[PDB]
Amino acid sequence: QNITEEFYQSTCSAVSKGYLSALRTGWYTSVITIELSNIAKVKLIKQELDKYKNAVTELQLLMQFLGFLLGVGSAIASGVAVCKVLHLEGEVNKIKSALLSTNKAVVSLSNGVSVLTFKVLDLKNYIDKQLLPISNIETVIEFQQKNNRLLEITREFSVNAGVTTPVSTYMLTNSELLSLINDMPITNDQKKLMSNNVQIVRQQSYSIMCIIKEEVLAYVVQLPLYGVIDTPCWKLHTSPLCTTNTKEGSNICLTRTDRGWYCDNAGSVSFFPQAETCKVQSNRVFCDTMNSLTLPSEVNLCNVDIFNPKYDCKIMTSKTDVSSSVITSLGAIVSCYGKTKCTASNKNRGIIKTFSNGCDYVSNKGVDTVSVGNTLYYVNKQEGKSLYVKGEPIINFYDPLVFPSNEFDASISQVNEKINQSLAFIRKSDELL
Amino acid sequence: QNITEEFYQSTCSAVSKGYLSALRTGWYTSVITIELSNIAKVKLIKQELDKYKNAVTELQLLMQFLGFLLGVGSAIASGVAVCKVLHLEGEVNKIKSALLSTNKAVVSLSNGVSVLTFKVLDLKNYIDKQLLPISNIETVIEFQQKNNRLLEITREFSVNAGVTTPVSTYMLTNSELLSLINDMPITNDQKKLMSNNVQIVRQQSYSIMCIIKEEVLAYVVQLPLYGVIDTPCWKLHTSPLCTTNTKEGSNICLTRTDRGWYCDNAGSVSFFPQAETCKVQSNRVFCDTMNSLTLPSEVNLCNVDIFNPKYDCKIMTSKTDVSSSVITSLGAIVSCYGKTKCTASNKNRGIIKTFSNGCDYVSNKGVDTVSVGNTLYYVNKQEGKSLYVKGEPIINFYDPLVFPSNEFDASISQVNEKINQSLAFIRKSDELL
Amino acid sequence: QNITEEFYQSTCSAVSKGYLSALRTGWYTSVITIELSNIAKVKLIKQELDKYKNAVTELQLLMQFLGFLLGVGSAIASGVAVCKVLHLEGEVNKIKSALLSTNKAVVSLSNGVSVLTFKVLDLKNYIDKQLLPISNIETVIEFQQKNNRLLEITREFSVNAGVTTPVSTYMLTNSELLSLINDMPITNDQKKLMSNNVQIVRQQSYSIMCIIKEEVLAYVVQLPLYGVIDTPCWKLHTSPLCTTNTKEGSNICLTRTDRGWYCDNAGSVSFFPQAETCKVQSNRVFCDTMNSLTLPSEVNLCNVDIFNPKYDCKIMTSKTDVSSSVITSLGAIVSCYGKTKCTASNKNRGIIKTFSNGCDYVSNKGVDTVSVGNTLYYVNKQEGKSLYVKGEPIINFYDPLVFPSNEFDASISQVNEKINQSLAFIRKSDELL
């Protein structure tokens, strides 16, 4: 897989490279229908047939740091747009007519939308051609199986107010989901990616209850669409970088705020400031463009040179020199300040390194845990090569007398400009004397 | 329903009107009891009777932007207050005695609390009057049905440490929940609202495990109380408003921070800064006053005039001119800055509008998606009328030389006051020359 | 239990004492294995045996304020480290060989890790010694019971992408979990604590799907380790403290930002800024050191004296004088400002106190609810003694002309230092006249 990582002592940050993209860029909606019946061991069927009427009753009763820079979307706007078309007159019968001979038919909606309608369960057929004439053991088995799926679908929709996620196997089975993947108009690369990670596909999917009317239960499944695949991705880990003066309250701190996931995307870079919104499966990174910013590709220069003139690297400043650790992909960043006991240990041998005041780093080769104060961090044991890029911490380049003490959404240039405003004021008033 | 929306080009904000309120203002607590038994196809009953003892064993083992301005409540403080009364001596028998003939009896607690006690399952009767004498198929059916509910109730309480939400149908069935709604001392308007949105009621409810003692399992259901209904509500959408100078790093930005839900409430306005804490069902807005601030009604003047003297409109400032979009109720706000490609498209025809640098807006009439950079947003297809209120963007009225560069919790007056402090300093030092 | 609480009028804060610690400090990993079969009422077994093959198919398809100051850990790094060892050649057979006679055997891994391997379900034995020879009712019962557990384990892993939490009873039963607690190398105090709060243990546990290969399904259970028990804990509640001038926009506010849980830990204090990450069971406080900072023990002096020279107490400043309430353990803090109607009421008697502008406090003795504006707060009815420590609000000691108007991550000394910079500038320019 070749996962690599570089730590930067100058900026107290680390970049993990070698990942491949899998970005949710669009949606694939399809209408899923279940035909209903409008109504010895028969006591078993009578009981199961009353669970049926309770599920129909429940369904009809249902319808009567930089994360703040992100936009605001409507996650199920595309799926709900299909439900509202189905509420029109004759639109449900257009589906019920095309699904009279086959189970998977493309019904063009009245507004020119080509939805892939798929009937997955035919209780109308099984109830109207097997039980209304009224004894084999398979008949009670085949009914308790088809009815159990309707009960689970009803169970999820009632507890989730008609919108469920992830999409369960009762909403859409693997045999049916893999059938949709082979029929949607996408690349073979996209089909192979979805087929090998169906659980990730289910977690990024939505199941929206639309309508139950005229012996038909319809709900829209909103499937993810991966329009960006196999592009380079890298994760940026940052930690506070402070000075280490002896007396408390005399130290200045600096933290890069642009941490998160980065993936090359169409000549630009997609930046995901909330790394918790991306799921990692080996070297594949599943993200969602809804939680991303589109930045110029020059943003990658901040990791090698934070003072470059092409991009203005984002930082925040404070005077809070508290100790903590950031567990990276192949190691651990450690910000040790004050009287905190910061160590890195091995399970078989114990403490093998004691960190000094400042920001340091250790790799997972030989290290299993790090301890910062009273917090024990287990490190990731992923195979990969780390590189310790030595350098002077940039916080030493600043004079604490004219240092902007508390900025939350600043940058290297904003700090330098605010320093010049202070130095120019000192310069002009020193001349008065 | 008549949902309307106005966009304000001067402040890069939009207001969606035409909604009706449904605010959770109080709680209705009731004690739910399940009487227990203290102990051919009999092999089916013996198996189901051991699931019974496992559930009893598990139950006894169980008991041995402006969101930061909100207060801090205790969500289940009212329900837990009822559990602690039931732990007193003889208080469980007061319930077990009044529920000896009827299933729904009002037992006045020792501290003057009038709780509506409701026995929903009588396993003590079914086990002590149908199986201890010891073969009909209905007896195995009626026992596997009553026992399955106890197993599900036990399943939810163990995984949730005795506090579950939403309240499932096993905790309280629709027939029992609708019985409680008809018996609680509230308006007919309140009863009709809860009966048509039982799934929303379940999501705003709590189920608290109290005690299992003396053949009685007691748990308190905490139901929502909607003391504010059918008042006007409106949602405010905001987006960053920046200048569009050519060179990077020379632009100033301004964002209204008072976005969220607003509902008229008792001469004041309830403001919900986290719009994700409110659920929209058509034109009804279900919120919770616990996540609200009580503001004067003059706060609505900020949408028409952000420089009014009656209310001080809240804004934040920055120099970060990143592009993004905010999906409104009937359209989309687009903040396009820098080299970002911002478009609005139709599914059948493609790109129909290309946005320029600045803050613009488009309605859902004819537009299905907007693209900002690498992010594709689907717009809501709700029926409604939008109005583009043209105006000069207020960010052009400020001089970047004396602009407060980074404020996170400021207002129009706070910015103007900080500008005067800079202009008065420039004025008095220019006179020295 | 002796829960006490002191309110501090000078700083608008309250401390709840009398709690005992239960801190998750490490992890206990163990490998859980399920042996699989590689393949009248027989129609019931044929149906259940096809559910078996569907579960095996699904499993193989699965593998192909101050919170921002916290560090970043990898929660399942220790459990995943054990999965990656099991993927090595012959490592699964080392477990399958040692579990040939007994169900609980310690298999030393190839990297010197001593994992406690535990086989909980033997479907390979039941299928290969009871059904392949092919009619008793118990055989269909004993198979539908063992198979149902595999179906639930498969159900949770598929919807959670192979990592589930809390750990359900199907992943690990109470009889098996209590067996692991008695065998792990910890104190009797630690074993008794886990045995009385198994549901809390399950909520702090992880179940990680490792591998399914060679008729063996292996998944690692990651159990919490409580290395800090029965130490004093206390919770700090804070609320905005503002001036109460008549005209709007002329008031300054001050809020202590160090609210959260505090527990004495190894000569230092573990601070949990997100009190929502700690669970309270009576007087026991279950937290996780991953969400904690390690502060000096002198931090407790801020509650008695916020101007002490030993520790620099953290505060934030603003001009936003909005009303709200903070529900404490034994009472309620009320910040009433402006025209807001703030009251405290009793259920039987109604309003018993009307708050004035400023920050006040009331205890739960006699008070059941407080109302701030349009928000009704229920107070906790925990038994305990409150103490109202009177004092002058510190916000009156500041001159609004030289008050730092908006600081988000500041302290008492940072504010005083920024005031001296303003007073020294006023002093030197007044001399010019």
PDB file of C-alpha atoms in Angstrom, chain A residues 25 27 40 43-44 47 51 58 61-62 64 68-69 71-74 77-78 81 84 111-112 155 158-161 265-266 268 270 289-290 292-294 310 314 407-409 414 418 425 428, chain B residues 65 136-138 141 145 152 166 169-170 174 195-196 198-200 203 248 279 316 318-320 322-327 348 372-382 405-406 408 425 429:
ATOM      1  CA  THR A  25     -19.866  13.532  -5.271  1.00  0.00           C
ATOM      2  CA  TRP A  27     -26.515  10.655  -5.630  1.00  0.00           C
ATOM      3  CA  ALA A  40     -54.089 -26.579  12.502  1.00  0.00           C
ATOM      4  CA  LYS A  43     -53.192 -20.200  14.007  1.00  0.00           C
ATOM      5  CA  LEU A  44     -49.583 -19.442  13.046  1.00  0.00           C
ATOM      6  CA  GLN A  47     -50.964 -14.462  14.017  1.00  0.00           C
ATOM      7  CA  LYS A  51     -48.545  -8.590  12.338  1.00  0.00           C
ATOM      8  CA  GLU A  58     -47.897   1.871  11.491  1.00  0.00           C
ATOM      9  CA  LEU A  61     -49.775   6.437  10.692  1.00  0.00           C
ATOM     10  CA  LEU A  62     -46.315   7.647   9.638  1.00  0.00           C
ATOM     11  CA  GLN A  64     -50.483  12.292   7.757  1.00  0.00           C
ATOM     12  CA  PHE A  68     -17.377  26.323  10.680  1.00  0.00           C
ATOM     13  CA  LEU A  69     -16.168  27.472   7.235  1.00  0.00           C
ATOM     14  CA  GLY A  71     -21.440  25.303   3.636  1.00  0.00           C
ATOM     15  CA  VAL A  72     -24.874  23.961   4.525  1.00  0.00           C
ATOM     16  CA  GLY A  73     -26.517  21.350   2.306  1.00  0.00           C
ATOM     17  CA  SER A  74     -29.708  19.304   2.349  1.00  0.00           C
ATOM     18  CA  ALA A  77     -32.977  16.864  -1.045  1.00  0.00           C
ATOM     19  CA  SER A  78     -32.561  14.624  -4.100  1.00  0.00           C
ATOM     20  CA  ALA A  81     -37.573  15.392  -4.690  1.00  0.00           C
ATOM     21  CA  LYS A  84     -42.963  14.476  -4.049  1.00  0.00           C
ATOM     22  CA  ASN A 111     -40.927  15.867 -14.778  1.00  0.00           C
ATOM     23  CA  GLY A 112     -38.473  14.033 -17.044  1.00  0.00           C
ATOM     24  CA  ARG A 155     -39.665  -0.858  12.490  1.00  0.00           C
ATOM     25  CA  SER A 158     -41.175   4.446  12.638  1.00  0.00           C
ATOM     26  CA  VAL A 159     -38.196   4.944  14.961  1.00  0.00           C
ATOM     27  CA  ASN A 160     -36.445   7.209  12.418  1.00  0.00           C
ATOM     28  CA  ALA A 161     -39.503   9.246  11.311  1.00  0.00           C
ATOM     29  CA  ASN A 265      -9.748  16.751  -7.155  1.00  0.00           C
ATOM     30  CA  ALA A 266     -10.085  18.218 -10.660  1.00  0.00           C
ATOM     31  CA  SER A 268      -7.963  21.693  -7.062  1.00  0.00           C
ATOM     32  CA  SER A 270     -10.781  19.020  -1.571  1.00  0.00           C
ATOM     33  CA  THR A 289     -17.711  16.488  -0.675  1.00  0.00           C
ATOM     34  CA  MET A 290     -20.566  18.075   1.301  1.00  0.00           C
ATOM     35  CA  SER A 292     -15.309  19.808   2.089  1.00  0.00           C
ATOM     36  CA  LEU A 293     -13.826  23.087   0.933  1.00  0.00           C
ATOM     37  CA  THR A 294     -12.307  23.541  -2.525  1.00  0.00           C
ATOM     38  CA  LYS A 310       1.888  31.458  -2.901  1.00  0.00           C
ATOM     39  CA  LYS A 314      -3.859  29.261   8.450  1.00  0.00           C
ATOM     40  CA  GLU A 407      -6.408  34.856  17.307  1.00  0.00           C
ATOM     41  CA  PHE A 408      -8.723  32.002  16.317  1.00  0.00           C
ATOM     42  CA  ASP A 409      -9.107  32.389  12.522  1.00  0.00           C
ATOM     43  CA  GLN A 414      -2.379  38.198   9.195  1.00  0.00           C
ATOM     44  CA  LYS A 418      -0.538  42.756  12.920  1.00  0.00           C
ATOM     45  CA  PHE A 425       3.703  52.174  16.469  1.00  0.00           C
ATOM     46  CA  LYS A 428       7.112  56.291  15.663  1.00  0.00           C
TER      47      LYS A 428
ATOM     48  CA  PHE B  65     -22.855  29.766  15.386  1.00  0.00           C
ATOM     49  CA  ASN B 136     -53.325 -25.415  22.640  1.00  0.00           C
ATOM     50  CA  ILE B 137     -51.333 -23.735  19.879  1.00  0.00           C
ATOM     51  CA  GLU B 138     -52.665 -20.312  20.904  1.00  0.00           C
ATOM     52  CA  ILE B 141     -48.475 -18.006  20.556  1.00  0.00           C
ATOM     53  CA  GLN B 145     -45.878 -12.548  21.962  1.00  0.00           C
ATOM     54  CA  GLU B 152     -37.179  -6.080  23.560  1.00  0.00           C
ATOM     55  CA  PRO B 166     -36.755   7.482  20.892  1.00  0.00           C
ATOM     56  CA  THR B 169     -43.346   0.562  20.209  1.00  0.00           C
ATOM     57  CA  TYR B 170     -42.319  -2.111  22.726  1.00  0.00           C
ATOM     58  CA  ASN B 174     -49.542   3.169  19.515  1.00  0.00           C
ATOM     59  CA  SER B 195     -51.925  12.101  17.148  1.00  0.00           C
ATOM     60  CA  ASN B 196     -50.891  13.047  13.597  1.00  0.00           C
ATOM     61  CA  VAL B 198     -46.646  10.147  16.793  1.00  0.00           C
ATOM     62  CA  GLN B 199     -43.203   9.342  15.365  1.00  0.00           C
ATOM     63  CA  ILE B 200     -42.038  12.880  16.139  1.00  0.00           C
ATOM     64  CA  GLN B 203     -38.377  10.912  19.026  1.00  0.00           C
ATOM     65  CA  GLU B 248      -5.515  37.435  -2.365  1.00  0.00           C
ATOM     66  CA  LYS B 279     -37.419  18.861  12.719  1.00  0.00           C
ATOM     67  CA  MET B 316     -18.639  37.934  12.863  1.00  0.00           C
ATOM     68  CA  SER B 318     -12.740  37.459   9.207  1.00  0.00           C
ATOM     69  CA  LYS B 319     -10.326  37.638   6.276  1.00  0.00           C
ATOM     70  CA  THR B 320     -11.090  34.092   5.053  1.00  0.00           C
ATOM     71  CA  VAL B 322     -13.531  30.769   0.943  1.00  0.00           C
ATOM     72  CA  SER B 323     -16.393  29.740  -1.325  1.00  0.00           C
ATOM     73  CA  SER B 324     -19.409  27.771  -0.106  1.00  0.00           C
ATOM     74  CA  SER B 325     -23.181  27.518  -0.476  1.00  0.00           C
ATOM     75  CA  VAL B 326     -26.146  27.463   1.901  1.00  0.00           C
ATOM     76  CA  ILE B 327     -29.185  25.483   0.763  1.00  0.00           C
ATOM     77  CA  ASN B 348     -32.335  18.211 -18.154  1.00  0.00           C
ATOM     78  CA  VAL B 372     -19.421  25.430  -5.622  1.00  0.00           C
ATOM     79  CA  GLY B 373     -15.921  24.258  -6.458  1.00  0.00           C
ATOM     80  CA  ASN B 374     -15.932  20.475  -6.111  1.00  0.00           C
ATOM     81  CA  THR B 375     -19.138  20.295  -4.037  1.00  0.00           C
ATOM     82  CA  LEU B 376     -22.513  19.534  -5.626  1.00  0.00           C
ATOM     83  CA  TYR B 377     -25.573  20.664  -3.653  1.00  0.00           C
ATOM     84  CA  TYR B 378     -29.083  19.449  -4.390  1.00  0.00           C
ATOM     85  CA  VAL B 379     -31.679  22.134  -3.683  1.00  0.00           C
ATOM     86  CA  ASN B 380     -34.981  21.525  -1.921  1.00  0.00           C
ATOM     87  CA  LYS B 381     -37.894  21.182  -4.353  1.00  0.00           C
ATOM     88  CA  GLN B 382     -40.494  22.514  -1.911  1.00  0.00           C
ATOM     89  CA  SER B 405     -10.116  41.868  11.187  1.00  0.00           C
ATOM     90  CA  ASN B 406     -11.169  38.899  13.357  1.00  0.00           C
ATOM     91  CA  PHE B 408     -16.205  35.959  16.504  1.00  0.00           C
ATOM     92  CA  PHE B 425      -6.678  57.645  17.035  1.00  0.00           C
ATOM     93  CA  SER B 429      -2.149  61.718  15.692  1.00  0.00           C
TER      94      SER B 429
END
